[PDB]
Design a protein around this nucleic acid. Structure first.
Lengths: 64, 134, 120, 175, 51, 61
RNA sequence: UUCUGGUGUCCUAGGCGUAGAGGAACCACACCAAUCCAUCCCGAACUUGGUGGUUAAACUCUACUGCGGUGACGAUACUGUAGGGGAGGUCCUGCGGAAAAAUAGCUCGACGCCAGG
RNA sequence: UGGCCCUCGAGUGCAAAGGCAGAAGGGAGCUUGACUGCAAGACCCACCCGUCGAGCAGGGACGAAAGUCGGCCUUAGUGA
RNA sequence: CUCAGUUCGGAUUGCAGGCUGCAACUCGCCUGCAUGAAGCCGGAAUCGCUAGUAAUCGCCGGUCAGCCAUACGGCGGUGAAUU
């Protein structure tokens, strides 16, 4: 229908802070995007947190 | 004894008919009390016969009360007789026709069930007998 | 739920209101994805009077590569169903839509049936 | 553009993974549907306008304020009241917003659970639901101080034990 | 309240074939004024029968 | 002190039975609701009564 | 002259399910776009115009009594008349009619019109 | 809000009964037949009453047409 | 920064340390990071003070291995209004 629907643009520029640009179709023309799923720390964030931070004995030996 | 919910408060009477061909068989229990005589049996005689044969067995076995009243009888007061105003919370009544099993019993030997079923048949306005599970 | 049961349910919905009479027959259509069908039938004797189809006009003007039902072949089969029952004694007819809503090629099919003077 | 990535690579390995015999028996995603569960939108008039403008910029098209199926006592619900504002988008918008669930919901969730093998498991026709990301990053987020409801139900054609979970697994939904 | 009330046409006291005022019984009007198109007046086509 | 005696007196029923000669306009069935649906050569009424359109017998199927 | 598929009508109503088959033709889904048209949003539905592949879904045909529907005979309750018993509740006879439920079975419909090949 | 199952158990301004599943139940468009003059024949029938009605003319409403509409699914809501 | 629960406020909690002392969990202090609670001058009532006083800012001592001391005992700095 006309006159009610928002402008669904085909040229939507997805800009990453790591100098990567991909094309998607959406509302805005430009999208400044953070941690988006390709090269996201979901393989290393669960490696750094809940998997390696727990220590009580090797913390004790570093002060003696 | 008495139904909890009643679909209709007062309900008029209904006349006895021939031999009940459905409720004549024995479902549970080994022995039974078959009625030869069509009349009404209130919940009061059912309490009397139930206490009679439960306390006449008194060691083992279980009885089976078959019938439930499901219809009321409205007794008018002594108020010079014209209306059927309120008689619904008064005594309930079970219709029994011939053939129908009234009581059953199991876990009891021969003559202990003969005195159990036969003594508890004296608490009852209609002539009966005891029936073996054939 | 499905589309075919929806069409059949719409056609039974239409059939309650319109009935074939011995004075006025009823012509029903079927717009299959390859072919149209049109049936001048008489319900009180339970037999057809004048049936045509895309397999009748398709001797001369058809393209099976294209989507078979077009508005132009609806114009043509309304033309031949308008001149096929006129030579039989069928002037005053009771048109129903065949379970399909009227805004389509059945516009020009019905008006094409009106083009040869049929009392619609 | 992920429909072209949907065509040639992730359909034939579902064709040979289940060991079919024909092409069209392989299932596909049918439609997704978003609702905004709101109990107070006749009073909050600018929250319903926030659903129209803001939620119409969340999804592809304008959402629909939903009239009440019945009136339940206790709540402020009458016959025909706005109980949530929903939208049903479908087509290439469907691929574009499951795409926006790959891009805008999978790496930007504070939790790291993703698709769940213990949720949306058993259905007659398999449906996947999420309660996440009340505002997309296209909308200036700090205006709406209310965590409004938002559910995105995906639909499929399959009636199996494997195929929808592998369908979201082949797309950008790790866990 | 359900007030009974009469609809009426445009009067036109004339010497035509039985030309005269036409009022019709109607109900329910506890609202804005509703002229309905009750017709077959003494003049045979008619519209906007007032009150 | 009774809350009764509220009879109605209203009557209905089948007026013309099957294999019987009907008249044009003869009321065949007076009914509450539709126990008898209108077949052919009949008509349904304003209060769902069934009248005959033409002469002849009446049937049920 | 069978199949195919629009169409009905009688119907014991013919359905669910398990199995096998059909894409020459026909019917049906699927992909592309939207000009009339359209969905209180979506070409999901409806419409128009085409690529035109499959039987996957849906239709059609053939089997099964596992459910479902239907359903006996004989009996028996009941009942119309003519009577009899009982204190009552109520029962029994002569003749006529005759159940219901259950069971043995029956049923995966049957007849017509028109257009291909 | 999405999907399967049972398929009429929901609903119909209100009491019950009989109805009604591609509906008489819910929605949307246009609407004023909630007209005029009537009316063959029926039911109910102490009378008074009361109920249904094919069909005709005028002038229309909807629909593309076929057709339908003389208030409401019906029975109560009244007074010579 | 120039009006905010804020570069106000610092509570509570976590991680990592140090010191004292046989020993620091219940129950010591202190450092480094993390969090940033309540609290926008206080109802009814109520208290101290007539001048180097009030208010305000620090320093020291005692006991003491170390400390719960925001207390106590002192000592200066700035320094009023009112009767």
């Amino acid at each position: 229908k006309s006159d009610i629907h928002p402008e669904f643009r085909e040229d939507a520029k997805v800009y990453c802070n790591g100098e990567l640009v991909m094309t998607t179709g959406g509302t805005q023309k430009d999208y400044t995007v953070e941690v988006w799923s390709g090269n996201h720390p979901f393989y290393l964030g669960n490696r750094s947190a809940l998997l390696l931070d727990a220590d009580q004995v090797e913390k004790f030996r570093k002060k003696y | 004894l008495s139904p909890k919910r009643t679909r209709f408060r007062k309900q008029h009477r209904g006349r006895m008919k021939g031999i009940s061909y459905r409720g004549n068989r024995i479902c549970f229990g080994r022995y039974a009390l078959q009625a030869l005589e069509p009349a009404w049996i209130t919940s009061r005689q059912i309490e009397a016969g139930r206490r009679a044969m439960t306390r006449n067995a008194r060691r083992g076995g279980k009885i089976w009360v078959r019938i439930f009243p499901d219809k009321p009888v409205t007794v008018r007061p002594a108020e010079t007789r014209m209306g059927s105003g309120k008689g619904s919370p008064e005594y309930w009544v079970a219709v029994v026709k011939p053939g129908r099993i009234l009581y059953e019993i199991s876990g009891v030997a021969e003559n202990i069930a003969r005195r159990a079923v036969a003594i508890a048949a004296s608490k009852m306005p209609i002539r009966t007998q005891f029936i073996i599970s054939g | 739920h499905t589309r075919r049961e929806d069409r059949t349910a719409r056609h039974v919905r239409i059939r309650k209101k319109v009935e074939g009479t011995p004075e006025r027959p009823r012509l029903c259509v079927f717009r299959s994805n390859k072919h149209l069908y049109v049936q001048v039938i008489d319900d009180t004797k339970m037999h057809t009077l004048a049936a045509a189809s895309t397999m009748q006009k398709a001797i001369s003007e058809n393209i099976d590569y294209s989507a078979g039902p077009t508005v132009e072949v609806a114009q043509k089969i309304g033309e031949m169903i308008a001149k096929s029952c006129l030579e039989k004694g069928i002037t005053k007819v009771a048109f129903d839509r065949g379970g399909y809503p009227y805004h389509g090629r059945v516009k020009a099919l019905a008006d094409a049936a009106r083009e040869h003077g049929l009392v619609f | 553009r992920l429909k072209t990535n949907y065509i040639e690579k992730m359909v034939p390995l579902l064709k040979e993974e289940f060991s079919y015999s024909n092409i069209l028996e392989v299932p596909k995603v049918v439609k997704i549907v978003v609702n905004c569960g709101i109990g107070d939108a006749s009073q909050n008039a600018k929250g319903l306008d926030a659903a129209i403008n803001e939620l119409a910029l969340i999804t592809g098209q304008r959402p629909v304020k939903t009239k009440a199926k019945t009136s339940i006592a206790g709540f402020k619900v009458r016959e025909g009241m706005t109980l949530g504002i929903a939208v049903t988008l479908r087509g290439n918008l469907m691929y574009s917003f499951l795409d926006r669930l790959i891009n805008l919901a999978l790496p930007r969730t504070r939790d790291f659970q993703g698709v769940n093998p213990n949720s949306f498991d058993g259905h007659g026709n398999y449906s996947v639901g999420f309660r996440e990301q009340s505002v997309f990053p296209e909308i200036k987020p700090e205006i709406v101080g209310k965590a409004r409801g938002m559910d995105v139900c995906i639909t499929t054609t399959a009636k199996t034990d494997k195929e929808a979970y592998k369908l979201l697994s082949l797309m950008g939904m790790p866990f | 309240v359900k007030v009974i009330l009469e609809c009426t046409g445009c009067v036109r006291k004339s010497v035509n074939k039985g030309s005269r005022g036409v009022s019709r019984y109607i109900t329910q009007k506890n609202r804005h004024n509703t002229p309905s198109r009750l017709e077959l007046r003494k003049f045979c086509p008619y519209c906007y029968k007032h009150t | 002190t009774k809350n009764g005696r509220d009879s109605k007196g209203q009557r209905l029923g089948v007026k013309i039975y099957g294999d019987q000669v009907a008249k044009p306009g003869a009321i065949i069935i007076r009914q509450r609701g539709t126990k008898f649906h209108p077949g052919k050569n009949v008509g349904i009424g304003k209060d769902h009564t069934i009248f005959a359109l033409i002469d002849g017998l009446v049937k049920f199927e």
